[PDB]
Protein backbone atom coordinates (compact mmCIF):
# COMPACT_ATOMS: atom_id res chain seq x y z
CA UNK A 1 0.00 0.00 0.00
CA UNK A 2 3.00 1.81 -0.12
CA UNK A 3 4.10 0.23 -3.11
CA UNK A 4 4.36 2.92 -6.13
CA UNK A 5 1.32 5.00 -6.52
CA UNK A 6 -0.81 3.94 -9.53
CA UNK A 7 -2.96 6.94 -11.65
CA UNK A 8 -5.88 7.36 -12.08
CA UNK A 9 -7.31 4.90 -14.99
CA UNK A 10 -7.54 6.88 -18.51
CA UNK A 11 -10.14 5.91 -21.51
CA UNK A 12 -7.86 6.44 -24.63
CA UNK A 13 -9.78 7.75 -27.19
CA UNK A 14 -10.47 5.49 -30.05
CA UNK A 15 -12.49 6.01 -33.20
CA UNK A 16 -15.16 4.89 -35.00
CA UNK A 17 -14.25 2.89 -38.16
CA UNK A 18 -16.96 4.74 -40.11
CA UNK A 19 -15.95 8.28 -38.93
CA UNK A 20 -12.98 8.54 -40.38
CA UNK A 21 -12.32 10.90 -42.72
CA UNK A 22 -9.24 10.76 -45.62
CA UNK A 23 -9.12 14.35 -47.15
CA UNK A 24 -7.10 14.97 -49.93
CA UNK A 25 -5.63 18.95 -49.35
CA UNK A 26 -3.67 20.79 -52.27
CA UNK A 27 -1.58 23.34 -51.39
CA UNK A 28 1.05 25.55 -53.50
CA UNK A 29 4.85 24.61 -53.00
CA UNK A 30 7.95 25.35 -55.42
CA UNK A 31 7.59 22.05 -57.05
CA UNK A 32 7.09 22.76 -61.38
CA UNK A 33 3.69 21.65 -59.90
CA UNK A 34 1.89 24.70 -58.61
CA UNK A 35 -1.64 23.25 -57.73
CA UNK A 36 -0.78 19.43 -57.91
CA UNK A 37 0.78 19.25 -54.72
CA UNK A 38 -1.10 17.51 -51.88
CA UNK A 39 -1.19 15.85 -48.57
CA UNK A 40 -3.69 13.13 -47.34
CA UNK A 41 -4.81 14.13 -44.28
CA UNK A 42 -6.57 11.51 -41.95
CA UNK A 43 -9.49 12.12 -39.81
CA UNK A 44 -12.91 11.80 -38.07
CA UNK A 45 -15.93 13.51 -39.27
CA UNK A 46 -15.83 15.48 -36.46
CA UNK A 47 -12.87 17.22 -36.66
CA UNK A 48 -13.29 21.08 -36.97
CA UNK A 49 -11.20 22.54 -40.48
CA UNK A 50 -9.55 24.36 -37.89
CA UNK A 51 -7.38 21.42 -36.59
CA UNK A 52 -6.65 20.44 -40.19
CA UNK A 53 -5.12 23.53 -41.22
CA UNK A 54 -3.12 23.66 -38.16
CA UNK A 55 -2.26 19.75 -38.73
CA UNK A 56 -1.03 21.02 -42.38
CA UNK A 57 0.94 23.98 -41.25
CA UNK A 58 2.79 21.95 -38.17
CA UNK A 59 3.49 19.11 -40.64
CA UNK A 60 5.98 21.74 -41.95
CA UNK A 61 5.50 20.31 -45.23
CA UNK A 62 5.08 24.11 -46.16
CA UNK A 63 7.87 26.06 -44.78
CA UNK A 64 9.32 26.75 -41.42
CA UNK A 65 8.87 28.84 -38.24
CA UNK A 66 5.42 29.80 -39.19
CA UNK A 67 3.64 32.37 -37.56
CA UNK A 68 0.37 34.08 -38.88
CA UNK A 69 -1.16 30.72 -39.46
CA UNK A 70 -4.45 32.71 -38.60
CA UNK A 71 -4.16 33.62 -42.18
CA UNK A 72 -4.66 30.41 -43.82
CA UNK A 73 -7.94 29.30 -44.79
CA UNK A 74 -9.31 26.30 -46.89
CA UNK A 75 -11.39 26.59 -49.60
CA UNK A 76 -13.46 23.86 -51.84
CA UNK A 77 -14.05 24.45 -55.46
CA UNK A 78 -16.37 22.48 -57.54
CA UNK A 79 -14.17 21.33 -60.78
CA UNK A 80 -16.44 21.68 -63.39
CA UNK A 81 -19.17 25.16 -62.44
CA UNK A 82 -16.69 27.37 -60.51
CA UNK A 83 -18.89 26.77 -57.50
CA UNK A 84 -16.26 27.59 -54.53
CA UNK A 85 -17.19 27.57 -50.39
CA UNK A 86 -15.06 29.12 -48.02
CA UNK A 87 -15.24 26.08 -45.32
CA UNK A 88 -15.18 28.09 -42.13
CA UNK A 89 -12.84 27.09 -39.60
CA UNK A 90 -14.48 25.93 -36.81
CA UNK A 91 -17.52 23.83 -38.64
CA UNK A 92 -16.66 19.76 -38.56
CA UNK A 93 -15.56 18.03 -41.74
CA UNK A 94 -19.03 16.16 -41.50
CA UNK A 95 -21.28 19.11 -41.81
CA UNK A 96 -18.60 20.26 -44.67
CA UNK A 97 -19.89 17.22 -46.19
CA UNK A 98 -23.42 16.62 -46.07
CA UNK A 99 -23.60 20.43 -46.92
CA UNK A 100 -22.16 19.97 -50.34
CA UNK A 101 -19.99 16.57 -51.44
CA UNK A 102 -24.10 16.25 -51.08
CA UNK A 103 -23.62 17.88 -54.52
CA UNK A 104 -21.53 16.33 -56.60
CA UNK A 105 -19.14 13.31 -55.66
CA UNK A 106 -15.58 13.39 -54.25
CA UNK A 107 -13.62 13.04 -57.41
CA UNK A 108 -15.48 16.83 -58.52
CA UNK A 109 -13.71 18.24 -56.13
CA UNK A 110 -10.41 19.69 -54.34
CA UNK A 111 -9.50 21.43 -51.18
CA UNK A 112 -6.88 23.64 -51.37
CA UNK A 113 -5.21 25.32 -48.62
CA UNK A 114 -5.27 29.08 -49.01
CA UNK A 115 -3.95 32.53 -47.70
CA UNK A 116 -7.35 34.00 -47.15
CA UNK A 117 -7.73 36.63 -44.01
CA UNK A 118 -4.70 39.03 -44.30
CA UNK A 119 -3.09 40.65 -41.75
CA UNK A 120 -4.22 44.42 -40.79
CA UNK A 121 -0.50 45.41 -41.74
CA UNK A 122 -0.62 43.32 -44.78
CA UNK A 123 3.18 43.54 -46.44
CA UNK A 124 4.20 45.34 -43.55
CA UNK A 125 3.64 42.11 -41.30
CA UNK A 126 3.98 39.65 -44.16
CA UNK A 127 7.50 40.31 -43.88
CA UNK A 128 7.90 39.17 -40.62
CA UNK A 129 7.12 35.56 -41.36
CA UNK A 130 9.28 34.12 -44.59
CA UNK A 131 7.43 31.02 -45.32
CA UNK A 132 3.48 32.61 -45.38
CA UNK A 133 5.33 35.12 -47.40
CA UNK A 134 6.33 32.91 -50.27
CA UNK A 135 3.16 30.70 -50.08
CA UNK A 136 1.07 33.93 -50.52
CA UNK A 137 3.47 34.91 -52.89
CA UNK A 138 3.02 31.62 -55.18
CA UNK A 139 -0.61 31.58 -54.51
CA UNK A 140 -0.59 34.95 -56.06
CA UNK A 141 2.23 33.62 -58.50
CA UNK A 142 -0.22 30.79 -59.41
CA UNK A 143 -3.23 33.10 -60.30
CA UNK A 144 -1.02 35.32 -61.99
CA UNK A 145 0.03 33.07 -64.77
CA UNK A 146 -3.67 31.09 -64.84
CA UNK A 147 -5.48 34.34 -65.09
CA UNK A 148 -3.55 37.33 -65.60
CA UNK A 149 -0.28 36.39 -67.62
CA UNK A 150 -1.43 35.74 -70.84
CA UNK A 151 -3.95 39.25 -70.89
CA UNK A 152 -0.97 41.70 -69.84
CA UNK A 153 1.73 43.09 -72.64
CA UNK A 154 4.37 40.67 -73.86
CA UNK A 155 7.31 42.78 -72.16
CA UNK A 156 5.72 42.98 -68.97
CA UNK A 157 5.02 39.54 -68.89
CA UNK A 158 8.77 38.86 -69.54
CA UNK A 159 9.65 40.83 -66.64
CA UNK A 160 7.54 38.42 -64.42
CA UNK A 161 8.85 35.39 -65.65
CA UNK A 162 12.77 36.62 -65.25
CA UNK A 163 11.55 37.88 -61.94
CA UNK A 164 10.67 34.19 -60.79
CA UNK A 165 14.07 32.64 -62.33
CA UNK A 166 16.02 34.60 -60.51
CA UNK A 167 13.49 33.90 -57.73
CA UNK A 168 13.33 30.31 -57.96
CA UNK A 169 16.94 29.89 -58.93
CA UNK A 170 18.28 31.29 -55.84
CA UNK A 171 22.16 29.11 -55.56
CA UNK A 172 22.62 29.76 -59.29
CA UNK A 173 25.03 31.97 -60.66
CA UNK A 174 24.12 35.91 -61.97
CA UNK A 175 25.02 34.68 -65.27
CA UNK A 176 24.08 31.03 -65.61
CA UNK A 177 21.71 31.40 -68.25
CA UNK A 178 24.05 32.67 -70.86
CA UNK A 179 25.52 29.67 -71.62
CA UNK A 180 22.86 27.78 -74.76
CA UNK A 181 23.68 25.11 -72.73
CA UNK A 182 21.92 25.78 -69.85
CA UNK A 183 19.44 27.23 -71.96
CA UNK A 184 18.20 24.07 -73.65
CA UNK A 185 18.41 22.49 -70.18
CA UNK A 186 15.34 24.80 -68.94
CA UNK A 187 13.20 23.58 -70.92
CA UNK A 188 13.86 19.98 -71.25
CA UNK A 189 14.41 20.26 -67.53
CA UNK A 190 11.67 22.62 -65.97
CA UNK A 191 10.07 24.30 -69.33
CA UNK A 192 9.27 28.19 -69.63
CA UNK A 193 5.82 27.39 -69.87
CA UNK A 194 6.12 27.63 -65.75
CA UNK A 195 7.35 30.95 -65.92
CA UNK A 196 6.46 32.99 -68.86
CA UNK A 197 3.01 32.25 -71.08
CA UNK A 198 2.12 29.85 -74.06
CA UNK A 199 1.44 32.29 -76.90
CA UNK A 200 4.96 33.79 -75.66
CA UNK A 201 7.19 31.06 -77.03
CA UNK A 202 4.69 30.33 -79.51
CA UNK A 203 5.20 33.91 -80.92
CA UNK A 204 8.48 35.13 -81.27
CA UNK A 205 11.84 33.25 -83.12
CA UNK A 206 12.88 31.10 -80.42
CA UNK A 207 16.61 32.60 -80.76
CA UNK A 208 14.91 35.83 -80.18
CA UNK A 209 13.05 34.29 -76.49
CA UNK A 210 16.24 33.85 -75.78
CA UNK A 211 18.00 36.80 -76.41
CA UNK A 212 15.74 38.59 -74.35
CA UNK A 213 15.65 36.25 -71.65
CA UNK A 214 19.12 36.28 -70.97
CA UNK A 215 19.31 39.69 -70.89
CA UNK A 216 16.13 40.51 -68.97
CA UNK A 217 17.58 38.13 -66.48
CA UNK A 218 20.78 40.32 -65.95
CA UNK A 219 18.54 43.42 -64.44
CA UNK A 220 17.61 41.16 -62.05
CA UNK A 221 20.39 38.78 -61.56
CA UNK A 222 21.48 40.45 -58.51
CA UNK A 223 18.04 40.01 -56.26
CA UNK A 224 17.46 37.75 -53.14
CA UNK A 225 14.19 36.49 -52.97
CA UNK A 226 12.74 38.56 -50.39
CA UNK A 227 13.52 41.39 -52.89
CA UNK A 228 11.86 39.49 -56.20
CA UNK A 229 8.75 39.03 -54.15
CA UNK A 230 8.66 42.11 -52.82
CA UNK A 231 9.02 43.50 -56.06
CA UNK A 232 6.59 41.09 -57.73
CA UNK A 233 3.77 42.18 -55.13
CA UNK A 234 4.42 45.57 -55.77
CA UNK A 235 4.09 45.27 -59.77
CA UNK A 236 1.31 43.05 -59.43
CA UNK A 237 -0.72 45.71 -56.90
CA UNK A 238 -0.56 47.72 -60.09
CA UNK A 239 -3.44 46.05 -61.75
CA UNK A 240 -4.94 43.52 -59.70
CA UNK A 241 -6.16 44.50 -56.27
CA UNK A 242 -4.94 41.47 -54.26
CA UNK A 243 -5.44 41.91 -50.30
CA UNK A 244 -9.32 42.62 -50.61
CA UNK A 245 -12.27 41.09 -52.38
CA UNK A 246 -15.11 42.30 -54.65
CA UNK A 247 -18.73 41.90 -54.58
CA UNK A 248 -21.33 42.97 -56.35
CA UNK A 249 -24.37 42.86 -54.71
CA UNK A 250 -28.03 45.09 -54.05
CA UNK A 251 -28.03 46.56 -50.97
CA UNK A 252 -31.51 46.43 -49.00
CA UNK A 253 -32.80 49.79 -47.22
CA UNK A 254 -34.86 52.49 -47.76
CA UNK A 255 -34.26 52.80 -51.38
CA UNK A 256 -32.44 49.27 -52.35
CA UNK A 257 -29.48 50.38 -54.70
CA UNK A 258 -26.61 47.82 -56.80
CA UNK A 259 -22.80 48.37 -55.33
CA UNK A 260 -19.37 47.01 -55.18
CA UNK A 261 -18.04 45.77 -52.23
CA UNK A 262 -14.24 45.81 -51.00
CA UNK A 263 -13.29 43.73 -48.51
CA UNK A 264 -10.08 43.48 -46.54
CA UNK A 265 -8.07 43.99 -43.67
CA UNK A 266 -9.10 47.84 -43.63
CA UNK A 267 -12.66 46.82 -43.15
CA UNK A 268 -15.34 46.62 -45.58
CA UNK A 269 -15.71 49.53 -48.12
CA UNK A 270 -17.70 50.91 -50.81
CA UNK A 271 -15.78 50.91 -54.05
CA UNK A 272 -17.43 53.89 -55.72
CA UNK A 273 -18.02 53.59 -58.80
CA UNK A 274 -14.15 52.24 -60.45
CA UNK A 275 -12.14 55.21 -57.86
CA UNK A 276 -8.70 54.93 -56.45
CA UNK A 277 -10.75 56.40 -53.42
CA UNK A 278 -12.93 54.15 -51.69
CA UNK A 279 -14.13 55.72 -48.23
CA UNK A 280 -15.38 53.36 -45.35
CA UNK A 281 -18.21 51.84 -45.23
CA UNK A 282 -18.26 49.54 -42.00
CA UNK A 283 -15.67 48.81 -39.36
CA UNK A 284 -14.72 45.54 -38.23
CA UNK A 285 -14.25 46.37 -34.44
CA UNK A 286 -17.92 47.67 -34.76
CA UNK A 287 -20.01 44.34 -35.75
CA UNK A 288 -21.77 42.44 -33.94
CA UNK A 289 -23.44 39.67 -35.63
CA UNK A 290 -23.06 38.11 -39.12
CA UNK A 291 -26.43 35.90 -40.06
CA UNK A 292 -27.64 34.69 -43.76
CA UNK A 293 -31.16 34.22 -45.37
CA UNK A 294 -31.92 32.49 -48.51
CA UNK A 295 -35.02 33.70 -50.98
CA UNK A 296 -36.85 32.64 -53.36
CA UNK A 297 -35.12 33.34 -56.44
CA UNK A 298 -31.80 31.49 -55.09
CA UNK A 299 -30.60 34.73 -54.08
CA UNK A 300 -30.15 35.32 -50.45
CA UNK A 301 -29.01 37.92 -48.02
CA UNK A 302 -26.17 38.91 -45.91
CA UNK A 303 -26.93 41.00 -42.78
CA UNK A 304 -24.56 42.43 -40.05
CA UNK A 305 -25.35 43.64 -37.09
CA UNK A 306 -23.83 46.52 -36.00
CA UNK A 307 -23.35 48.81 -32.66
CA UNK A 308 -24.23 52.43 -32.98
CA UNK A 309 -25.96 51.59 -35.88
CA UNK A 310 -30.15 51.24 -35.08
CA UNK A 311 -31.37 49.60 -38.04
CA UNK A 312 -29.04 46.42 -39.38
CA UNK A 313 -27.08 46.47 -42.47
CA UNK A 314 -28.76 44.32 -44.95
CA UNK A 315 -26.59 43.05 -48.14
CA UNK A 316 -28.62 41.43 -50.86
CA UNK A 317 -26.28 38.49 -52.79
CA UNK A 318 -26.67 36.80 -55.75
CA UNK A 319 -26.48 33.38 -53.92
CA UNK A 320 -26.72 31.72 -50.61
CA UNK A 321 -23.29 30.51 -51.24
CA UNK A 322 -21.79 33.95 -52.63
CA UNK A 323 -23.71 34.78 -49.42
CA UNK A 324 -21.61 32.66 -46.97
CA UNK A 325 -18.33 33.18 -48.13
CA UNK A 326 -18.13 36.90 -47.56
CA UNK A 327 -19.96 35.90 -44.24
CA UNK A 328 -16.73 33.90 -43.42
CA UNK A 329 -14.63 36.49 -45.17
CA UNK A 330 -16.06 39.04 -42.68
CA UNK A 331 -16.06 37.07 -39.55
CA UNK A 332 -12.25 36.16 -40.41
CA UNK A 333 -11.22 39.56 -40.14
CA UNK A 334 -13.46 40.19 -37.17
CA UNK A 335 -11.53 36.74 -36.12
CA UNK A 336 -8.09 38.22 -36.56
CA UNK A 337 -8.65 41.80 -35.35
CA UNK A 338 -11.03 41.40 -32.67
CA UNK A 339 -9.85 40.27 -29.24
CA UNK A 340 -12.67 37.47 -28.72
CA UNK A 341 -13.60 34.03 -28.90
CA UNK A 342 -15.77 32.24 -31.70
CA UNK A 343 -17.32 33.41 -34.37
CA UNK A 344 -19.90 36.19 -34.70
CA UNK A 345 -22.28 34.77 -37.50
CA UNK A 346 -25.51 32.95 -36.35
CA UNK A 347 -28.11 30.29 -37.25
CA UNK A 348 -31.46 30.51 -34.88
Known amino acids: ELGPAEPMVVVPVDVEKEDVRILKVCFYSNSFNPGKNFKLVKCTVQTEIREIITSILLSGRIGPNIRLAECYGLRLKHMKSDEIHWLHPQMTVGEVQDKYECLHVEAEWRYDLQIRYLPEDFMESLKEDRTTLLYFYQQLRNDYMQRYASKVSEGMALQLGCLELRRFFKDMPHNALDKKSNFELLEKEVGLDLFFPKQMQENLKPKQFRKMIQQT?????????????????????????????????????????????????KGIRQLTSQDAKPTCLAEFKQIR?????????????????????????????????????????????CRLQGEHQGSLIIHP
Not at 232 to 258: K, P, V
Not at 315 to 320: F, V
Open 289 to 333: SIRCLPLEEGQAVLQLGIEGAPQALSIKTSSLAEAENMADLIDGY
Open 217 to 265: FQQYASLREEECVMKFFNTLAGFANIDQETYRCELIQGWNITVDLVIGP
